[PDB]
Amino acid sequence: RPGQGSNAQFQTSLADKTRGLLGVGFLRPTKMASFAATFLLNF
Amino acid sequence: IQHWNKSYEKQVYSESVALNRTFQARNQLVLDRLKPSGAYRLPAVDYKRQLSRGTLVEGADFYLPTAQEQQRLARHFEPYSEQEQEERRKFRFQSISVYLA
Amino acid sequence: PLGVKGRSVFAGMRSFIGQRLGRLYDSFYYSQSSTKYVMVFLFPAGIFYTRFRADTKLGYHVFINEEKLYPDYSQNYFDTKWTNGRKVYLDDETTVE
Amino acid sequence: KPSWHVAREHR
Amino acid sequence: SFAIPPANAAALADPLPATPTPPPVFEAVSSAALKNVEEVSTMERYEAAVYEESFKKPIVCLFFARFSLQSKVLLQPFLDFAASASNNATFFLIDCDRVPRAAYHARVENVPSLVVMKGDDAFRQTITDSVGVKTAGDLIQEARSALDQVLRLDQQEGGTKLQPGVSSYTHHIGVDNLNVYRKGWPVA
Amino acid sequence: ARSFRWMQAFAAVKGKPTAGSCAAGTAVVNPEDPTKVTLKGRYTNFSLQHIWEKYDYLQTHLLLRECMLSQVAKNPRLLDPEINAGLTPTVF
Amino acid sequence: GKIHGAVWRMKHLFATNFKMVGHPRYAYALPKNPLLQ
Amino acid sequence: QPGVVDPEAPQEVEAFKQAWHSRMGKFNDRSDTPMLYAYMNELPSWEYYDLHRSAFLEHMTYFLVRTGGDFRFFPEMPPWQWLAHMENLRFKLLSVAQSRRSQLQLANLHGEEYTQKFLQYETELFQACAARLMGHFMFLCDPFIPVQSAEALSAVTRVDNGKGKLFSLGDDVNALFYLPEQQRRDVERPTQAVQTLLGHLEATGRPFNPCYSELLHVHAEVLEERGEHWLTAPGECVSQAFLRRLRTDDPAYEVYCSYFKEMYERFAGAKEVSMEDGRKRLATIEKNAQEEAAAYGLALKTMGSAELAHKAR
Numbered sequence: 001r002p003g004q005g006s007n008a009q010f011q012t013s014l015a016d017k018t019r020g021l022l023g024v025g026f027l028r029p030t031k032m033a034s035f036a037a038t039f040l041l042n043f
Numbered sequence: 044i045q046h047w048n049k050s051y052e053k054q055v056y057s058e059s060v061a062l063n064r065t066f067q068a069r070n071q072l073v074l075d076r077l078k079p080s081g082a083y084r085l086p087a088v089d090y091k092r093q094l095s096r097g098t099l100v101e102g103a104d105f106y107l108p109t110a111q112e113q114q115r116l117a118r119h120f121e122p123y124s125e126q127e128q129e130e131r132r133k134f135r136f137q138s139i140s141v142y143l144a
Numbered sequence: 145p146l147g148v149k150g151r152s153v154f155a156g157m158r159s160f161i162g163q164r165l166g167r168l169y170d171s172f173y174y175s176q177s178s179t180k181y182v183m184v185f186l187f188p189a190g191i192f193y194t195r196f197r198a199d200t201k202l203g204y205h206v207f208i209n210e211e212k213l214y215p216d217y218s219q220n221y222f223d224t225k226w227t228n229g230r231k232v233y234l235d236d237e238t239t240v241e
Numbered sequence: 242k243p244s245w246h247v248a249r250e251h252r
Numbered sequence: 253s254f255a256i257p258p259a260n261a262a263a264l265a266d267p268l269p270a271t272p273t274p275p276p277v278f279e280a281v282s283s284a285a286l287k288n289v290e291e292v293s294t295m296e297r298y299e300a301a302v303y304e305e306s307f308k309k310p311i312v313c314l315f316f317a318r319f320s321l322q323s324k325v326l327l328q329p330f331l332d333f334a335a336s337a338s339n340n341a342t343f344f345l346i347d348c349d350r351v352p353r354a355a356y357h358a359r360v361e362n363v364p365s366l367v368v369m370k371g372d373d374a375f376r377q378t379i380t381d382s383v384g385v386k387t388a389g390d391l392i393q394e395a396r397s398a399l400d401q402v403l404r405l406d407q408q409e410g411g412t413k414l415q416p417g418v419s420s421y422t423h424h425i426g427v428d429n430l431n432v433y434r435k436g437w438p439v440a
Numbered sequence: 441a442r443s444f445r446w447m448q449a450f451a452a453v454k455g456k457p458t459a460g461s462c463a464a465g466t467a468v469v470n471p472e473d474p475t476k477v478t479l480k481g482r483y484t485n486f487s488l489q490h491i492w493e494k495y496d497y498l499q500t501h502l503l504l505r506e507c508m509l510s511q512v513a514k515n516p517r518l519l520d521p522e523i524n525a526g527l528t529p530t531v532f
Numbered sequence: 533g534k535i536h537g538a539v540w541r542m543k544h545l546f547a548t549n550f551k552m553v554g555h556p557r558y559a560y561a562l563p564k565n566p567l568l569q
Numbered sequence: 570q571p572g573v574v575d576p577e578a579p580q581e582v583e584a585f586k587q588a589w590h591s592r593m594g595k596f597n598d599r600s601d602t603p604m605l606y607a608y609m610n611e612l613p614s615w616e617y618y619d620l621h622r623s624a625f626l627e628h629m630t631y632f633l634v635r636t637g638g639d640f641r642f643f644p645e646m647p648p649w650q651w652l653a654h655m656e657n658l659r660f661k662l663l664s665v666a667q668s669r670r671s672q673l674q675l676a677n678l679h680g681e682e683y684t685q686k687f688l689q690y691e692t693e694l695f696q697a698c699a700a701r702l703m704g705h706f707m708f709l710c711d712p713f714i715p716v717q718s719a720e721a722l723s724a725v726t727r728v729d730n731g732k733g734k735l736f737s738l739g740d741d742v743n744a745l746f747y748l749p750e751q752q753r754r755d756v757e758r759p760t761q762a763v764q765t766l767l768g769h770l771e772a773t774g775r776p777f778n779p780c781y782s783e784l785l786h787v788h789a790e791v792l793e794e795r796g797e798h799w800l801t802a803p804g805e806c807v808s809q810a811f812l813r814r815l816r817t818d819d820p821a822y823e824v825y826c827s828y829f830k831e832m833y834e835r836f837a838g839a840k841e842v843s844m845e846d847g848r849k850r851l852a853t854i855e856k857n858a859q860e861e862a863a864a865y866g867l868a869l870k871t872m873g874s875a876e877l878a879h880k881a882r
């Protein structure tokens with residue numbers, strides 16, 4: 001197959017998939033709070 | 044100095060590998076399942092891409108719905124039909140009487 | 145050519161609503177996670193709660209005569225001291241006790 | 242403003 | 253401030269010039285119209301199709317480009333699929349560099365691309381491999397599934413339930429602003 | 441000399457402009473029928489010309505690299521001239 | 533008032549030209565001159 | 570619309586267009602007085618690539634190699650699979666480079682410009698090699714195989730196990746071509762090609778640098794990612810594939826077309842020659858070929874760039 005060589009490298013752990021489901025480094029509630037603060041200050 | 048900085052780089056790359064694994068997992072678990080089909084995509088293309096394609100038009104803040112109205116300035120002989128002329132002749136002035144009433 | 149035979153204006157409404165909802169989902173998916181969740185769930189929810197509470201329940205401004213009668217709010221967080229003039233929302237069945 | 246280095250968040 | 257220079261003689265030149273052909277020895281290698289499709293070379297033809305034939309019976313368009321090898325691999329099986337299902341749908345073969353406005357219309361971003369169309373917005377399904385994992389067989393299977401789906405939906409509900417959507421009022425002007433001329437709107 | 445004929449030709453065609461520095465198309469309206477409009481050019485889903493104008497050569501470079509790999513899979517002694525000349529990074 | 537001024541200028545600048553039978557952007561629609569060759 | 574006598578005038582039209590562009594720019598562009606650029610944590614493709622020129626280069630080279638295509642089809646947002654593969658390859662390369670640095674740079678005691686110079690020098694080198702080979706019709710000659718020595722003749726004959734034919738041209742072509750059997754006229758995988766090249770170089774005693782070796786290996790890997798048909802179609806040759814994938818707006822288009830025309834019309838009439846009849850010829854071919862190789866160093870100073878000149882000196 002064309003992409004099997006690359007897709008073989010994509011093997012995750014149980015903790016890895018749990019962390020992805022939770023969205024640790026991609027939700028960024030600190031970023032959300034910063035946005036809220038800036039938006040309220042912009043009034 | 045040397046050893047500590049090189050170990051700093053190595054741990055940076057360990058963190059990078061961890062981030063990449065969780066990124067792959069997040070994608071292939073949640074986003075590949077929640078990805079929109081594309082039927083309800085945005086019905087437009089950005090003006091920059093249009094400009095690169097040579098497709099952008101800028102003008103006509105207004106429009107002319109009917110071809111009868113589009114081809115007036117090109118007909119040169121009958122911009123308005125006879126019936127349309129007779130109808131237009133009734134609005135040569137504004138009706139202050141109707142305004143007042 | 146407006147309308148088609150065999151189709152109903154209600155079916156047209158349903159199709160239009162489906163289109164709108166699909167477009168909304170697409171636009172929410174292709175958006176920043178930093179702003180969309182907040183602006184779409186947390187501000188609306190708080191505004192809804194506040195407006196509903198204000199327009200439905202009935203509140204009272206409570207004062208206390210002396211400082212020795214003030215409650216002890218040292219343990220509970222976000223309020224370490226009593227302040228007179230406090231707005232308190234209650235239910236219609238509430239008693240003085 | 243453009244640069245040759247990419248931050249962690251924009252990686 | 254953002255600008256892009258208008259164009260160059262190179263860009264405006266013929267994108268599909270002829271190249272030399274080898275003698276009958278290089279062709280000897282280890283790995284060694286069509287009466288069922290229509291090769292499109294004119295946006296006039298493409299619009300005629302999309303606006304009349306796509307409303308009569310569905311169409312399947314293969315957008316390709318010469319530089320692509322996946323397109324050469326997918327051509328023949330696409331011709332077989334056409335010979336198979338030419339009774340239920342029409343089949344068109346488009347080159348993006350020869351007819352770009354047709355590629356802008358179908359919203360194709362990668363080549364090769366299958367596009368199943370009916371009503372021009374009632375059922376537009378695009379099949380492609382943006383990652384590089386699928387193959388010609390998988391693409392053709394997806395195309396068969398999409399054609400089955402569109403035929404079933406067309407038969408469903410006394411021919412209705414497949415009505416154009418946003419194209420009813422957009423006219424693909426946000427995609428390609430040149431449709432204002434087609435619609436007759438001014439440009440001053 | 442006659443062997444470097446092709447080097448001379450390449451040096452001749454050196455700085456000719458390409459489509460990677462400008463838009464890929466242009467519209468022309470039929471004066472007799474303004475409702476008719478043609479698009480002269482190519483296809484493009486690309487708008488980063490102000491960056492690609494400096495790397496325009498990479499496409500053909502990588503094509504040449506693939507072709508060199510194909511030739512070397514059969515005969516690897518075709519690069520020996522440059523190795524001996526010292527152009528490539530090598531550790532004798 | 534804007535419309536009034538526009539028409540008031542159109543009068544002076546068009547009604548006595550002999551060269552503007554219509555607008556130049558639509559001269560393609562005019563018949564062809566039998567005197568030119 | 571303005572109350573002017575002629576709103577459809579070219580002055581008005583151009584003024585409206587310029588105002589349109591200025592408004593759209595003032596609204597969308599990233600500036601010191603931004604209107605829409607605000608609350609930015611996840612950037613779109615255009616702004617991302619404009620701010621991070623390093624990623625545009627990497628994401629672009631990966632696109633051209635993973636999918637042999639033109640920059641005009643560059644995707645708006647790349648797939649996470651591609652991004653992950655890029656990160657893995659970066660980890661590999663930087664691990665190798667960091668080990669080498671640890672072991673050399675410390676025992677001893679602007680990346681954009683460096684990358685630009687490296688790429689320019691490399692493309693110049695490959696163009697010069699291609700020209701040198703086209704000088705004798707050895708650039709892209711498949712299923713044929715060029716030979717300039719008896720050692721190479723034996724090496725390439727071991728492919729088909731002595732079978733096949735050998736063709737020649739008279740005293741103007743300085744090499745002899747070999748045609749294997751139709752069943753063995755295939756093309757080999759890029760990983761195998763790189764392995765063969767490196768093995769030959771290390772047997773001759775001229776190994777590349779480790780960084781360049783890893784570069785070749787990653788290139789071969791991203792090429793393998795294409796699958797079965799990575800360079801050619803079933804009934805296609807390498808020259809046809811090159812002319813197919815060749816950018817039409819490339820200045821060298823006519824040069825390559827001329828070369829391939831001449832090569833076709835020559836190979837069409839090329840004569841056949843047996844095995845022993847070439848070796849004695851391969852001797853003088855090797856002689857004049859090493860002479861031409863010695864002359865090549867000076868020839869680079871004739872028209873080559875300052876980089877090639879200084880690296881030859």
Ligand SMILES: CCCCCCCCCCCCCCCCCC(=O)OC[C@H](COP(=O)([O-])OCC(O)COP(=O)([O-])OC[C@@H](COC(=O)CCCCCCCCCCCCCCCCC)OC(=O)CCCCCCCCCCCCCCCCC)OC(=O)CCCCCCCCCCCCCCCCC
Nearest residue numbers: 129130131132133134135136137138139140141142143144
């Ligand atoms: C009970 C059911 C519910 C209630 C419904 C009641 C009945 C209404 C039913 C619906 C309408 C009728 C339906 C049947 C019609 C059948 C006949 C027919 O087909 O043709 C019509 C019939 C014949 O039509 P026709 O054959 O084409 O020939 C027409 C004539 O040639 C004449 O053509 P013309 O070009 O010469 O036009 C004449 C025009 C002349 O042109 C003008 O209008 C110039 C003057 C404009 C004044 C400024 C306009 C401000 C507009 C504000 C509107 C909202 C105000 C809030 C409402 C309450 C106001 C107290 O005079 C007018 O008629 C317009 C009068 C506007 C109202 C005046 C408001 C006061 C202005 C105050 C200004 C002074 C301020 C300082 C005050 C201090 C003083 C000391 O004539 C009409 O009835 C005309 C319709 C009038 C409608 C108003 C004009 C449009 C203005 C739009 C304003 C925005 C409204 C937004 C709408 C809501 C949002 C969607």
Ligand SMILES: CCCCCCCCCCCCCCCCCC(=O)OC[C@H](COP(=O)([O-])OCC(O)COP(=O)([O-])OC[C@@H](COC(=O)CCCCCCCCCCCCCCCCC)OC(=O)CCCCCCCCCCCCCCCCC)OC(=O)CCCCCCCCCCCCCCCCC
Nearest residue numbers: 085086156157160164165167168171184185188189418422
């Ligand atoms: C409890 C938790 C709550 C949290 C939220 C949970 C989720 C709930 C649903 C979300 C509710 C919020 C809605 C936000 C939408 C607008 C803001 C936004 O961010 O949109 C961005 C979002 C993404 O847009 P984009 O990415 O920037 O560009 C893509 C285009 O939008 C793509 O455009 P397109 O090509 O697909 O189509 C063009 C589009 C155009 O949309 C736009 O681009 C802008 C739309 C303008 C918005 C503001 C217009 C205000 C106009 C003033 C009204 C004056 C009327 C005067 C009447 C006088 C006559 C007497 O057409 C429309 O959708 C607009 C139609 C409605 C406009 C009505 C204006 C009057 C014209 C009447 C026309 C005839 C009626 C329609 C008949 C249709 C056939 C049945 O917009 C959309 O997805 C479509 C536009 C929104 C359409 C409305 C969707 C339904 C909303 C239901 C609201 C009901 C809420 C109450 C719930 C019950 C509570 C108790």
Ligand SMILES: CCCCCCCCCCCCCCCCCC(=O)OC[C@H](COP(=O)([O-])OCC[N+](C)(C)C)OC(=O)CCCCCCCCCCCCCCCCC
Nearest residue numbers: 145146147148151152153154155156157159160415416420
């Ligand atoms: C009530 C106060 C209103 C005053 C302010 C509003 C302005 C007053 C004028 C009326 C407003 C509505 C105008 C609708 C015009 C659209 C007509 C149309 O054909 O659209 C295309 C749709 C889709 O048609 P179609 O796609 O199914 O088939 C036809 C296909 N073409 C067009 C290609 C031929 O047609 C309809 O089915 C009729 C829709 C209008 C009826 C609904 C009114 C919309 C307003 C309510 C919004 C909420 C919807 C949910 C309601 C749920 C009810 C329980």
Ligand SMILES: CCCCCCCCCCCCCCCCCC(=O)OC[C@H](COP(=O)([O-])OCC[N+](C)(C)C)OC(=O)CCCCCCCCCCCCCCCCC
Nearest residue numbers: 077168169171172174175176179180183184605606607608
């Ligand atoms: C008389 C009254 C006249 C006045 C008119 C009154 C009616 C009309 C008033 C409209 C004006 C106000 C409109 C403001 C809208 C702003 C809201 C907004 O866009 O959101 C911010 C976000 C911000 O996105 P962003 O952050 O990526 O970019 C925003 C702009 N920049 C780039 C500058 C930062 O917008 C969206 O992306 C989504 C908008 C569409 C969704 C709207 C909410 C409904 C969502 C329902 C779907 C839920 C799916 C859940 C699935 C979960 C799993 C994935």
Ligand SMILES: CCCCCCCCCCCCO[C@@H]1O[C@H](CO)[C@@H](O[C@H]2O[C@H](CO)[C@@H](O)[C@H](O)[C@H]2O)[C@H](O)[C@H]1O
Nearest residue numbers: 192193195196197198199200201202234235236237238
């Ligand atoms: C999807 C359709 C949604 C449409 C909107 C429907 C309304 C949704 C919100 C309903 C809230 C129901 O929850 C209920 O609200 C009312 C009003 O605050 C509260 O009730 C309160 O006001 C009423 C009026 O005096 C009394 O019951 C009492 O004084 C007090 O308890 C209930 O304690 C609470 O349980």
